[PDB]
């Protein structure tokens, strides 16, 4: 009753904070994917210079 | 006889005041239990923010 109804409202804002934290981390994934675009494209250019040496 | 019968009527209202004071304190216990519902639910939310830091 007393802590049961209090944990019903608390669980509602906790699951909206779980879904919106998964959205914020979904903006993190494409940013580190673009950092790996600089790593793979620049390091393939280093393969151009080393292979011609 | 004289203070003995006087203390019989006085003891009757004293034991009705003991039982009804135990009832009034039984309304006090669930009110401080709801204050501990704010302490444990709010302080578990503070555990959410501190654990993500």
UniProtKB/Swiss-Prot annotation, chains A, B:
This is Capsid protein G8P. Belongs to the inovirus capsid protein family. GO terms for cellular component: helical viral capsid; host cell membrane; membrane. The chain holds residues 30 to 82 of 82 of the full protein. It is a single-pass type I membrane protein. It comes from the Viruses. Residues 1-25 are periplasmic. Self assembles to form a helical capsid wrapping up the viral genomic DNA. The capsid displays a filamentous structure with a length of 760-1950 nm and a width of 6-8 nm. The virion assembly and budding take place at the host inner membrane. It is found in: Virion; Host membrane. Residues 46-53 are cytoplasmic. The chain crosses the membrane at residues 26-45. Keywords: Capsid protein, Helical capsid protein, Host membrane, Membrane, Signal, Transmembrane, Transmembrane helix, Virion. Homomultimerizes. There are several thousands of this protein in the phage capsid. The gene is VIII.
């Amino acid at each position: 009753a007393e802590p049961n109804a209090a944990t019903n409202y608390a669980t509602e804002a906790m699951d909206s904070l779980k879904t919106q934290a998964i959205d914020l981390i979904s903006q993190t994934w494409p940013v580190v994917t673009t950092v790996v675009v600089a790593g793979l494209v620049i390091r393939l250019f280093k393969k151009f210079s080393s292979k011609a040496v």
